[PDB]
Ligand SMILES: [Zn+2]
């Protein structure tokens with residue numbers, strides 16, 4: 001069920017510690033040899049492999065300066081670590097780093113809550129960036145993944161777009177139990193206009 005302590009613990013650990021988060025501005029990919037569903041980057045001192053769902057997404061960022069905002073998992077192999085993998089999280093760089101406050105509407109066990117917000121400075125952001133910033137907020141404010149009282153067990157993060165298209169994320173999706181399994185959902189690298197949507201969260 002959604003009351004599995006291990007999974008809740010790993011899901012929380014994944015979104016709580018910034019250690020797992022890879023944030024880099026105006027970066028360009030390494031001229032390495034890659035497949036058609038990935039792009040190798042060198043962020044900080046780590047080697048990062050960014051995977052995408054479709055093969056046409058790669059071509060769009062190749063040798064172009066991009067902004068990265070994605071969660072990552074350590075790839076385990078018989079070599080000197082430093083190998084990390086992430087899904088999506090890429091958008092072309094931008095000179096308009098202006099601040100945008102995305103309204104976050106939380107329904108806490110049926111009760112409407114006071115207006116909350118998350119900030120982003122890209123005019124076009126990825127769903128993943130929004131989902132990450134929201135979950136960090138819910139963890140801090142409501143402790144939705146707690147393993148002592150386990151007050152919460154169901155919830156959804158809904159990106160309510162003005163274009164009649166909704167992106168839904170289940171706050172209690174554990175994949176198979178591994179981080180890459182939990183992060184694969186962001187592989188579509190879907191992006192959206194920062195000012196054309198708001199967030200609706202339901203937790204119980
Ligand atoms: Zn709405």
Ligand SMILES: [Zn+2]
Nearest residue numbers: 160161162164
């Ligand atoms: Zn709508």
